[PDB]
Amino acid sequence: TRKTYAIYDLLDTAMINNSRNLNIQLKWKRPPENEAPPVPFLHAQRYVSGYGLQKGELSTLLYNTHPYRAFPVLLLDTVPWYLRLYVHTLTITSKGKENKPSYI
């Protein structure tokens, strides 16, 4: 994205001298609902499913908010030994259909 920055050069003696210091001020409030920037193209969440003290499930949600482009992601998970995992129960679903990973 094209971004504009204001630069304060502290080595310039026009900016900072012995007789005058620097205090920068900035006016900003939460913008109205309209004119707010769009959400990023990628974000994710993680949670635990079930109840009790015997069995459960670990779930992750991945979002693609781009209008027309698909892109790949690489996912890394580490789990302690006490939570024993069953790999024949692993499922990946997009839009109600099964998604087959290229590498695992």
Partner: protein, 184 residues
């Protein structure tokens, strides 16, 4: 045995199945609750004495074969029945499927009914413990209102009832033999 083991090697070209099966049975590393006597004992153990106690409690299974063969030399099938019951009671990871097998033999020995004592109470106790397993499992694991001591007590009672029942049958057998030889 030798041929079966050597054949098993060639399925995956490894010897890794052996520690995974027989070492697991002999060493009892997993502490999942069951109807047996090992899990809570080894979850509450002082590390100094663990080796000694595992050795003792796995010798206990193989212990009785020799004296039982000395006494029951002329009655091999009753000997088999007793041995199967002992295996079911004192194994490391027991299940009710192991229990059903020796209960299938009770009709063979029901001509000994007149010499049986305290059969009624033992049957009632076993029946009660069977139903009390799921309710206390629920109260511990889902409700959160109970703890592991309830479940441990139920396992203790179940095993004690089994032992008493087997001892009763053995006594009745010997009493009938005595009356046959010496007179009623």
């Amino acid at each position: 045995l030798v041929v079966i083991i050597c054949l098993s090697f060639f399925l995956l070209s490894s010897w890794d199945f052996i520690p995974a099966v027989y070492g697991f049975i002999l060493s009892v590393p997993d502490l999942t609750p069951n109807i047996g006597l090992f899990w809570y004992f080894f979850a509450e153990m002082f590390e100094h004495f663990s080796l000694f106690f595992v050795c003792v409690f796995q010798i206990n299974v193989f212990f009785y074969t020799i004296p039982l063969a000395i006494k029951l030399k002329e009655h091999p099938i009753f000997f088999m029945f007793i041995q199967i019951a002992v295996i079911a009671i004192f194994k490391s990871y027991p299940t009710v499927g192991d229990v059903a097998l020796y209960m299938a033999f009770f009709p063979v020995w029901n001509h000994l009914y007149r010499f049986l004592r305290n059969i009624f109470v033992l049957t009632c106790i076993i029946i009660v413990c069977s139903l009390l397993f799921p309710v206390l499992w629920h109260l511990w694991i889902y409700a959160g209102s109970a703890n592991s001591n309830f479940f441990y007590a139920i396992t203790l009672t179940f095993n004690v009832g089994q032992i008493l029942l087997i001892s009763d049958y053995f006594y009745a057998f010997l009493r009938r033999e005595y009356y046959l030889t010496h007179g009623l």
